[PDB]
Amino acid sequence: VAQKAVLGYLNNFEEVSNLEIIAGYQDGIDIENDKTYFVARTRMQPYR
Amino acid sequence: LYISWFEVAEEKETDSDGNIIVSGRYRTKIRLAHLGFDGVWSSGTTLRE
Amino acid sequence: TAAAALDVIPNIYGLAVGGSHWGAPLNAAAEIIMIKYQADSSKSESLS
């Protein structure tokens, strides 16, 4: 049962490792010590 | 293991005056798939090279 | 993906063009959200 459980995760894992960053929000006009949010998606389809 | 298709499709190349030669370039596509580590498909994507 | 394919491009072209089913994705989201409950309330029967 463990092998079915392991491979069911390992199929999903590779899509996450291939995620592509599209844009990032700088703190309006400020610099240094920023939280700097970023947005990313799956390449294989634009779904996620 | 990977699998693929070629799409066969029609739509009119409609002219504003209307036309008979409604043909030439269509948004046909080419599609790819693969089966994962348990045999279910996922990468059923459209590269359309 | 079916709801998106019924939306992103038209059904028909000619003197009249269109047929994109406006509500299709948001109408589909409620079914996706519903399905979680039947599984988790039967995982509770498995673990019971």
From Swiss-Prot, chain B:
Annotated knockout phenotype: Cells with a disrupted yenA1-yenA2-chi2-yenB-yenC1-yenC2 locus are no longer pathogenic in C.zealandica larvae.
Post-translational modification as stated in the protein's UniProt record: The isolated toxin complex includes 3 peptides starting between residues 768 and 778 of this protein, which might be physiologically relevant.
Annotated localization: Secreted
Complexes and interactors: Semipurified toxin complex consists of at least YenA1-YenA2-YenB-YenC1-YenC2-Chi1-Chi2. The Yen-TC:K9 subcomplex is about 26 nm tall and 22 nm in diameter with 5-fold symmetry and 5 copies of YenA1, YenA2, Chi1 and Chi2; the chitinase subunits may be solvent accessible on the exterior the complex. The Yen-TC:K9 subcomplex has no insecticidal activity. The native complex with additional YenB, YenC1 and YenC2 subunits is 16 nm taller and is insecticidal; the toxicity-conferring subunits are present at about 1 copy each.
Function comment: Part of an orally active toxin complex (TC) with strong insecticidal effects on larvae of the Coleoptera Costelytra zealandica, Acrossidius tasmania and Adoryphorus couloni and some Lepidoptera larvae. The TC has an endochitinase activity.
Protein name: Toxin subunit YenA2
Organism of origin: Yersinia entomophaga
Source organism phylogeny: Bacteria, Pseudomonadati, Pseudomonadota, Gammaproteobacteria, Enterobacterales
Gene name per UniProt: yenA2
Residues of the full protein shown: 245 to 293 of 1364
